[PDB]
Write a protein that binds this ligand. Structure first.
Ligand SMILES: *CC(=O)N1CCC[C@@H](c2nc3ccccc3s2)C1
Ligand SMILES: *CC(=O)N1CCC[C@@H](c2nc3ccccc3s2)C1
Lengths: 304, 304
């Protein structure tokens, strides 16, 4: 029993984190096989942080201008390229701790763990979601760039995120590991406004199921609703629309708890319409939207 | 910017987790040097889970009755003893991944990371506090026993907790790594009621400082108070008393933010007396008490 905001063990990703220095700029890299992935803004000289032309900036850089340090040993860079907003540094040594890995672009609502790093040294691990406005509400100081988000499937690390940006509102923008930004964000020191941070309705429902499963049931009402009706209420409260895909994905939680998805929808509707009245659900005064259905099943079944 | 409930990287503790089987009972062990630490209730045969005499139960056990599996290789047990509520199994092989480690008994209010494990395989990592009633609000299924709580100081793992018990109210009781339970709990299937789960006042204050530091300032009031006055209010709201030690420990946060500790006390008092009025602080509708002052400084300074 008990439900916790839980990250994947970080061990496999700790073994991949290196320091990358270009001139006086230092941030974190990801060493997989003989390639080190890092944000290309490592090449920005504390001056061109406004309107960089990365192609032109890069012409001035050589293999030997990129300093890669894994523990307290330097890696030899034998090649470098730009793919979108990342640099791939070819090193002469394969990372001996390279786990089974993929690179995957996640959708909004998807949760992942972040290993926050400084000078290639990991400092902490937290659980995140990709927000519907393609930001993440991270924790990231200066030098945290190149820190990565990931999911683990048994022994395979799916890398979904690399850290690049803090928006002036203190939320976070980053790329997949092909260096394509999630959302409309650019690696440029420019007014960039995030859109509406809507609540991930499907994740709230999974977490309401997680609560029932752990004994917190006070919010279970006598009512049901329809997808159309529920969705009028969602719209009003800045909740993402519920699709038949969301209902299908919740099936197993529905099954295990014997609460129809649409019944749980009607419970959510009342909690939105009436608030918590000073009560809590799994020790929270608001509705948590950063556990997926897949996350709840994992933590309510002890998957490793 | 951004403040997150952050665990230590789990890598160093992942490398210590093994499976321990006695008869048909399996749970997790901690392999440091040539010793495997596990909860002694590994010896309870799905029947004596009510009134075990561990000394007598243990007479019937031999070195070869304890099956220790590290990855998919078995360790040879060359000795076994009981220290309080843990077993120490001497194996013939030193753990090659044994980090620098201590064993430390923490005080209530102290935070630590838990690597939740099943059959010696780690499934997730979360941040905890030792509650003033000496419980922890964990997430733990069957087979999670022997999962450990820890702090990391640079490269030294201070192990503070080993998991043993779920109380009938779904909170968690465990031992330090000398096998002494935190609080009055016993490794026995018996009515055990936890006491009053009070709020860790010092941790709430640190987290209010963390908020100021991250831009959430709406709750900063025009008032101050005294330790005595504030403590009348704390008492009424089931908050732990604030000592001069707590004030001293908050000094540096006070310094960095230029908000006197007692001024922040008066802000807390108003939030207790008036509630949140539907607002949030660092994306929370209640007052978080599971970040220590030491935790805030770490995450608001990028320590690795
Ligand atoms: C996020 C981090 O740790 N960084 C440290 C190295 C330089 C820094 C940059 N931020 C920007 C923003 C816009 C353009 C260029 C750069 S470099 C990233
Ligand atoms: C917590 C866990 O994973 N366990 C699995 C192995 C046996 C189980 C026990 N619980 C109790 C409680 C009271 C007395 C004896 C035992 S064995 C622990």
């Amino acid at each position: 029993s008990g439900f916790r905001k839980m990250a994947f063990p970080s061990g496999k990703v700790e073994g991949c984190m290196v320091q990358v220095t270009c001139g006086t700029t230092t941030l974190n890299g990801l060493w997989l096989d003989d390639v080190v992935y890092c944000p290309r803004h490592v090449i920005c000289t504390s001056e061109d942080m406004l309107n960089p032309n990365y192609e032109d900036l890069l012409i001035r850089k050589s293999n030997h201008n990129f300093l890669v340090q894994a523990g307290n040993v330097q890696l030899r860079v034998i090649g470098h390229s730009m793919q979108n907003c990342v640099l791939k540094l070819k090193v002469d040594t394969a990372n001996p701790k390279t786990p089974k890995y993929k690179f995957v672009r996640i959708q909004p609502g998807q949760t992942f763990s972040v290993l926050a790093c400084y000078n290639g040294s990991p400092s902490g691990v937290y659980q995140c979601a990709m927000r519907p406005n393609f930001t993440i509400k991270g924790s990231f100081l200066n030098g945290s760039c190149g820190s990565v988000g990931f999911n683990i499937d048994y022994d395979c690390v799916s890398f979904c995120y690399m850290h690049h940006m803090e928006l002036p509102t203190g939320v976070h923008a980053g790329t997949d590991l092909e260096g394509n930004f999630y959302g409309p964000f650019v690696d440029r020191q420019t007014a960039q406004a995030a859109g509406t941070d809507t609540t991930i309705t499907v994740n709230v429902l999974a977490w309401l199921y997680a609560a029932v499963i752990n004994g917190d049931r006070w919010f279970l009402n006598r009512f049901t609703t329809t997808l159309n009706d529920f969705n009028l209420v969602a719209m009003k409260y800045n909740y993402e629309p519920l699709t038949q895909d969301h209902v299908d994905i919740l099936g197993p939680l529905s099954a295990q708890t014997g609460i129809a998805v649409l019944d749980m929808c009607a419970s959510l509707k009342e909690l939105l319409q009436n608030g918590m009245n000073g009560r809590t659900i799994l020790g929270s005064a608001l509705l948590e939207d950063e556990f997926t259905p897949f996350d709840v099943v994992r933590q309510c079944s002890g998957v490793t």
